[PDB]
Design a protein around this ligand. Structure first.
Ligand code: CU
Ligand code: CU
Ligand code: CU
Ligand code: CU
Lengths: 123, 123, 123, 123
């Protein structure tokens, strides 16, 4: 268990800030603030992580969601990040994400962006 | 708001079952049971949805996570689904997902599966 | 070998038309015409397929690319489809695709769409 | 046009080697050698690029395919890379890829890996 390793404040290559608490039972709760896009201030996030990972050197699988509505803005979209926590001197969360926008059915083909974010504890 | 449209039991093309409650504030909570893979019985899920969607005919953006640990099994992996709810006689949730396994750093290149699930209220 | 099974005209769920020739050596060459997006008329495609698939009932892995420039339009983008051919009465090509647009480095995070197309020999 | 900027030998973060020729007309032809996976020696690749990119500082969209069959091995799979070329002192190709394996229909849900490769002209 990486409850203590995951809990805290993380930053990605875009300058976004992810603040998370890891529960003993697998929960992830916190706030996300994007440095880019149709976003301002903090948004709620929730997710899950493997609270009993393999002990063979593998990372810890996890994921979370942000719906891009808060008191300031509504971007009618949601991002999910799916990835793994890798602990140690230079801890990281390595993720791939899917960002779906609400669309009409005629536009659904162009609804979903894909990308990759790497989070560190410094910067 | 689609709190009432989303809340309930959904089934995908693989025969998996998704049971969700939508909160007024954007939360999604419930259980997932996969018909395939290294899985048995129910697993916790959490996620978020846009609680004030566009009124122009667009769908409602949402996402959720399952970490594949429960009292029965641990598949050292997490799936995130990112998609949209489309209401009406034949309501659907149309998703794309990312399934990340915990790996060593040598294996990280092969850590993540991608696919697509369509959920309906019947079958 | 599925050289004869793959070669010919295919249609997807959007009404796009894919015309391909499969070479003995693994090549795929042809034209694509999209029913959606910043596209008109035919565009060049090239790709590769497994010319000696497994004989255990598995599908035949393949992929191809279209750059969205022709004599009519330039959408400064490219799509790659990665998938498998499944032969038999109701033959199909089942794909997932990635559509990357040229962007500035500030915009690179929003450069790439993801989706899924299923091609059949009728419709 | 980036025919001269793209043509040549590129290396990714895994130590794989991509050797490509860019044609005046949008073609990409060459060989790929993976440092990882069920692969040995060189494999054929083909693809396409935007031969008349935007002049506003944007990158050049491109993609290519490798089917993992050569005279040595057959991994019954294909990878497609979709991305953009960014020119200048530290030129790069920034990609996302989809790796589909031939599967039975029961296994199709687990057929496709997703990841991201960054190619440079040194290392
Ligand atoms: Cu206010
Ligand atoms: Cu028990
Ligand atoms: Cu003309
Ligand atoms: Cu030999």
């Amino acid at each position: 268990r990486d409850e203590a390793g995951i809990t805290g404040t993380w930053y990605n290559q875009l300058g976004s800030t992810f603040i998370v608490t890891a529960g003993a039972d697998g929960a992830l709760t916190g706030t996300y603030e994007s440095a880019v896009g149709n976003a301002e201030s903090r948004y709620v996030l929730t997710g899950r992580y493997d609270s009993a990972p393999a002990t063979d050197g593998s990372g810890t699988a996890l994921g979370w969601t942000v719906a891009w509505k808060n008191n300031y803005r509504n971007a009618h979209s949601a991002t999910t990040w799916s990835g793994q926590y890798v602990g140690g001197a230079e801890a990281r969360i390595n993720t791939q994400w899917l960002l779906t926008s609400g669309t009409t059915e005629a536009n659904a083909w162009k609804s979903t962006l894909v990308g990759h974010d790497t989070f560190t504890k410094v910067k």
